[PDB]
């Protein structure tokens, strides 16, 4: 019975399909709609296509980056076993490529396939650093962060902007919209790091603090040598973790990431104000959206 | 710069390419050009596309059963870690799709997309029946094999009729030979592996012992009272050994191979008389065994 | 060394670590070094023996570099490796040469021979490590250290990725494998890596022969003893 075949493959993906993600990509899409003003028939499927990609990347991450739990409920890895979760994610992406090809075919979608292949180059750098111990630079961290999170918003804008409702010559609107998209994706990562360090993820990843500190001569040796024990033992200790947290509080680390966050906000608001003067009306959605990012 | 970031994605794929590939799918396609007679500039391209799909599938496979040594060299799982192998396998299959989405073909986008989704259903089942120990039946084993191995040759053929003078009164009589050839390999390939612990390594010569109506119920309970309490006992190691030897299941597999042939050599003949052109190539495939 | 670089059986006897315990061997070693400084000071103090102690402090900077790379996984350069080997092996030969001169003939100038002798010591000390490599790679040291072969390939774009990821599995798992080491040994023999050190050894000999001939004209006689040490390398 096909009802059984189609439901043993799709079974894992349904486990995180109904979790309360409380995402922001949906809220971001309906705010650009105030400008682009496209038919409602579209604005349904696009959320139903960008959501598939997000949940699929989540399955592949909670395996690559070995974690036991995420919030409350158990990880998709421990429930359905390792072998099935990978195949279920790999299959689900193929649906998303088809659901996109379904309608957009005129304007040359070869620029919507060229925007998915990069989302895997990004994580390849990430799994290469955490494994081979190579310390990052400063520009390399910002470049990697664009490849992984911000490129997903790039899909959303390039599909929204395909509906030139008897307007939008885009001659002056192509480049300008993209920088607005880029800045928010970069912001939505660093902002998570400041809330995260107010630990428990010292099992390999590379935050902004650690990359800023290891470039200040004081304690440069100490921090480098402590982290090496970690990847050798798989998790630091309950004691050694306290040492890095107190260094952060002394070299004034929790105050330099704050000083970078306030920089991107003034820049993006300037961009929106430049959009608000280019033959447009108020957009109280974007100007209320920034508050929902801590 | 950029060349650095580009060589980490393509590191595992370039490692499995250097293995000594068996090389059968690259000769079967060359034999069909006798009838269809497509240009060379495409035969080289279509071969490349099907090649990456099979190498990308296996990287997931040999990892889905953790084995430090597959043949000669170490396993990709034990050189590039595990997180790297999966995230490069995924990228590879998507890249193959993009090469089909171009001048390769214009209108039949749904045709090639659907034959790729199916390949994963026949592989999800394999993982299910392995993870729950629920041994299968012969009536469903043929389904899996045709949904997992044959679904590769099918794509190779459906794209070769899109370039080539005959008409649409032929394609119905070509898919039949494919599924027969695809099935016959898995059984013969498994046979070569044969000529104990289970852990999901099926074959025709193994699903037949658990269903031989003589001693069926007696065997079905020797396996249990076991795996969850200990590997085996000391007389059971001979018990499972001598039970399979008695009826010589290994010869019932011999009988089933001898039937596809007498159907096979009559399947080339049907097209052999449809198109007035001999085939010195289909006859040479049988030298494989 | 056989404690910091935890090793098994060496030449027929077990490592001094396992017999007397770890804590006891360290204290016995640190005591003997200070005992040797006192004998050195004793024989002479004129001509400034503040340069025989200033040249021992470096022998510990040398080993510190090696134990930091093997620990923190940082790949070496090629020029940087030559400095590490100079500090550790060559400096002991330098001590022996710097003490003989301080009391030899009390007549010879030596003014124009001080720099010349140091040039001879450096090349011989450097040579004895690169030549020692050939015997280790005909293995058992792929647990963190960096031979000359490994430094050449990881700087050649082909197969650089493969080996770098293989060795990383080691320091995380504590030892590579019995099979993967056969993989690493098989890579080396293909790109002719064990042939790039050979092409350096034949170069360094021509330098030593030229150097002694430059000394052989500076009021000196043949040395069938010095020229008998180099002959034992076929």
Curated annotation (Swiss-Prot), chain C:
Binding site for Mg(2+) 4: 1, 5
Residues at which Mg(2+) 3 binds: 1, 5
Positions of isopentenyl diphosphate binding: 11
Annotated positions binding dimethylallyl diphosphate: 10, 88-89, 129, 136, 145
Biological processes annotated in GO: alcohol biosynthetic process; isoprenoid biosynthetic process; mycotoxin biosynthetic process
GO MF annotation list: geranylgeranyl diphosphate synthase activity; lyase activity; metal ion binding
Annotated stretches, region: Geranylgeranyl diphosphate synthase: 1-234
Record's keyword terms, sorted: Isoprene biosynthesis, Lyase, Magnesium, Metal-binding, Multifunctional enzyme, Transferase
Subunit structure, interactors included: Hexamer.
Family the UniProt entry places it in: In the N-terminal section; belongs to the terpene synthase family.
The protein's role, per its UniProt record: Multifunctional diterpene synthase; part of the 2 gene clusters that mediate the biosynthesis of fusicoccins, diterpene glucosides that display phytohormone-like activity and function as potent activators of plasma membrane H(+)-ATPases in plants by modifying 14-3-3 proteins and cause the plant disease constriction canker.
Name under which the protein is recorded: Fusicoccadiene synthase
Taxonomy of the source species: Eukaryota, Fungi, Dikarya, Ascomycota, Pezizomycotina
Gene: PaFS
Part of the intact protein present: 474 to 718 of 719
